[PDB]
Design a protein around this ligand. Structure first.
Ligand SMILES: Nc1ncnc2c1ncn2[C@@H]1O[C@H](COP(=O)(O)OP(=O)(O)OP(=O)(O)O)[C@@H](O)[C@H]1O
Ligand SMILES: Nc1ncnc2c1ncn2[C@@H]1O[C@H](COP(=O)(O)OP(=O)(O)O)[C@@H](O)[C@H]1O
Lengths: 505, 125, 217
């Protein structure tokens, strides 16, 4: 099993060997005396980039089959009548020929379909003809038992019901992401040319590297190693001892971005303005968030939690969500905001959202944030108008428990509380955090020292003027920061800052 | 002398929190009244900036009352003060619940009112 | 439910029967429906829920539903469960807007006799009885079960002991405290379980749970 180049996949090969080949290994005298046909189809499914092509390929070599014949899903279609399906027919010709000629001593053939659900949807247009054509031939009036067809897909729940019957696609298998043991073995297999040929230093401990990389997909590890070696050699240019040391590995590890990992960049961008504790609330809020994070991580039964944060417009709500997220260390982090979705068509948005939901169920541990709701729902108050379908998508999503022991935290934010109750959606959410805006002068003091607006004289005078002038100070932080900058880059702080600040509250 | 200052802090905060509940009550009733005029209809949605503070005061009274009851374990008078604060805070919670329930029940009736009748002429497409 | 199961299994004429389980949200309807279904031995059992009907287009909705009825005719004994009607159809109150064709499909479907004396039972669930009255669909059903909330402290204690959360003094303290803290008590079991579990972790003593139990009602 592991003598060949595939690490971490152990049970799968026991199952596949037992079910598929245990009837092609023994001498035909026995199995004929047994009177059983051969399995004639296989469906293995999983997320992309996990090594499915590799396993499919290696199987044939193990059995000394003919060279594989390959095709990919969408290419089958043509735009003339019945040639879209002629192509499907062409593939079995040589197997037929060799069967009729030789008989039962023929050599096994292999065929690979890619992206099977791209064409073969439930029937009941070209599509029905295609599905039909495959059915009538996969098992037809004439016996043909020297062939094997392999199937590769991501969504099993969309293939037509009839192909999955005992006789056409018997064995269904699942391929999941590598575990830690998987990653360690993957490193061991990949770094064989380096090892025997002696161009790896003795300092690098690949076990540490495996531990450091989580949710890495199994393909990209190759990317890491080749990048590191290229880095080392390019750094060299001398032929004394071309050694790859840990520094290359660390560099390349830092550079690469996994697909199922943290999306740090947009979160750092979200909190570009900095987090200064101008008052007492901030501490409390962050403590709350930390508490809930712990509750998610430690429990067993509460596999999902929905948490809402809301407050007045401009109160700086989203930044807190980003902050809480970034101080957690979970492996999976993504962000959905109107920014991505702008410009797309309706169907596109629903597809995007639903994809983004399904991906998370695979990983052990996930947090997922939603930037704004009324914006996504396309609200406008006159009439009013909004899109019902997206609303339902979200409503349904926020109850789905993860299909397995995997775990999920959902964070969301809004400014239009009232609307949500008038919508009758509020039942989604278990707990709520509130974010009011500033109503004090000492808070202005804290922020302006943190921004270092001006020397103490200006600071003292302006707080005095606003004390004597504005008694019931009340604004959010957005206008405070922007107004402070405007006054800074403008002239004469009293001339504008005070006046603007009154005009804003 | 610190403890009594803390209890005074609790008392003053409970007083404001009651006040905010009553203000919120008024915000409800006038939002039920006026359904017609456009901009003022949007204007009563400042009720949001009354709800947020209610939540925050709830969380504060939560933490300081817990700290106070912990502090009063060895003194009967301190414990009595803590229990009084608990009682009053419970009553406040009850008032909040009552207001919320009444408003939910009233929002249902208005909803029934509006669409239980023949409707403006059919939409675009 | 058991009576109904027996009745449908053995009766020459009664080929088709339709029930309605209704109650307030969180009263826990689906659990009961599944429990009825499991202890009957009917060979064909299959379930429709919004869970499966996620993110496809409307035509797909109708197609899938149609298939799911069609296959059921081809077996001697069958039971189907439908979750949250008023949610398959896209009800939302302002306007109010909702999709019509799906509603019509269900209206027609729930009355069709299966061919050749084959046997079918249907359960469906909802939490919005009033709107069902309003839309004028309620004719289709032969009978109606009702599920209310829990409404007494002894029941809550039964719940605590089944959870094994309580201690012996703990139950007395919490029960007495809530006995005087809440005159009227009515909540859904789902929330109750959530609450007990969140209380089990932090500040196990009575307090957190007491104010939380208030915080439910
Ligand atoms: N403690 C804080 N209080 C207020 N603003 C802060 C705080 N820390 C950071 N910010 C700034 O707030 C901004 C990010 O918050 P954000 O723009 O999401 O506010 P918002 O009210 O959600 O926005 P909108 O008004 O569009 O809803 C950045 O400039 C960030 O630095
Ligand atoms: N478990 C694995 N072990 C070794 N190599 C792998 C594994 N998974 C992916 N790869 C590498 O990725 C490439 C195979 O692509 P693959 O992941 O099979 O395509 P896809 O999963 O997109 O169909 C090969 O270079 C292969 O060595």
């Amino acid at each position: 099993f592991e003598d060949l180049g595939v690490g971490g996949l152990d049970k799968e090969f026991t199952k596949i060997f037992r079910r598929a080949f245990a009837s092609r290994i023994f001498p035909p005298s026995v199995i004929e005396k047994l009177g059983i046909s051969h399995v004639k189809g296989l469906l293995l499914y999983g997320p992309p980039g996990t090594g499915k092509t590799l396993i499919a390929r290696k199987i044939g070599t193990m059995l000394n089959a003919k060279e594989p014949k390959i095709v990919n899903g969408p290419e089958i279609l043509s735009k003339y009548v019945g040639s879209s399906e002629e192509n499907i027919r062409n593939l079995f010709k040589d197997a037929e020929a060799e069967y009729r000629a030789k008989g039962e001593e023929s050599s096994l053939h292999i065929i690979i379909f890619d992206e099977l659900d791209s064409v073969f949807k439930q029937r009941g247009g070209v599509g029905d003809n295609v599905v039909n054509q495959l059915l009538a031939k996969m098992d037809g009036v004439d016996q043909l038992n020297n062939i094997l067809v392999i199937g590769m897909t991501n969504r099993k729940d969309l293939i037509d019901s009839a192909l999955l019957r005992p006789g056409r696609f018997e064995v269904q298998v699942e391929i999941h992401l590598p575990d830690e043991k998987g990653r360690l073995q993957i490193f061991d297999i990949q770094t064989k040319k380096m090892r025997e040929n002696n161009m790896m230093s003795d300092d690098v401990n690949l076990a540490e590297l495996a531990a450091l990389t989580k949710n890495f997909s199994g393909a990209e590890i190759e990317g890491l190693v080749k990048s590191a070696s290229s880095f080392a050699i390019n750094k060299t240019v001398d032929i004394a001892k071309l050694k790859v040391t840990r520094e290359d590995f660390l560099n390349a590890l830092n550079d690469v971005t996994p697909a199922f990992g943290i999306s740090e960049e947009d979160l750092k961008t979200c909190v570009e303005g900095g987090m200064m504790l101008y008052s007492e609330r901030v501490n409390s809020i962050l403590k709350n968030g930390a508490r809930y994070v712990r509750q998610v991580r430690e429990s067993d039964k509460s596999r999902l939690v929905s948490l809402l944060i809301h407050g007045p417009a401009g109160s700086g709500k989203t930044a807190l969500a980003a902050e809480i997220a970034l101080k957690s260390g979970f492996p999976f982090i993504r962000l959905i905001s109107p920014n991505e979705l702008s410009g797309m068509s309706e169907s596109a948005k629903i597809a995007y959202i639903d994809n983004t939901f399904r991906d998370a169920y695979k990983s052990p541990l996930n947090i997922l944030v939603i930037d704004s709701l009324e914006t996504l729902v396309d609200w406008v108050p006159i009439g009013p108008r909004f899109s019902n379908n997206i609303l339902q998508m979200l409503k349904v999503a926020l109850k789905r428990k993860p299909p397995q022991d995997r775990r999920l935290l959902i964070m969301t934010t809004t400014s239009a509380y009232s609307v949500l109750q008038q919508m009758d959606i509020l039942s989604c959410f278990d707990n709520e955090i509130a974010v009011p805006n500033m109503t004090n002068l000492d808070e202005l003091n804290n922020v302006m020292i943190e921004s270092n607006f001006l020397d103490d004289a200006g600071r003292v005078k302006v707080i005095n003027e606003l004390s004597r002038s504005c008694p019931n100070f009340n604004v959010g932080i957005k206008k405070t920061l922007t107004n402070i900058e405007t006054a800074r880059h403008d002239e004469d702080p009293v001339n504008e800052l005070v006046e603007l600040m009154t005009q804003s509250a | 002398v610190g403890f009594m200052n803390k209890i005074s802090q609790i008392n003053r905060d409970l007083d404001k929190y009651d006040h905010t509940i009553n203000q919120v009550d008024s915000l409800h009733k006038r939002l039920l009244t006026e359904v017609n005029e456009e901009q003022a209809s949007h204007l009563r949605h400042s009720l949001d900036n009354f709800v947020a503070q209610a939540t925050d005061l709830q969380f504060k009274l939560k933490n300081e009352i817990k700290s106070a009851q912990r502090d009063g374990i060895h003194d009967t008078n301190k414990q009595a003060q803590a229990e009084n604060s608990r009682q009053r805070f419970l009553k406040l919670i009850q008032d909040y619940r009552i207001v919320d329930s009444n408003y939910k029940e009233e929002n249902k009736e208005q909803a029934k009112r509006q669409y239980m009748i023949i409707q403006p002429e059919a939409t675009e497409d």
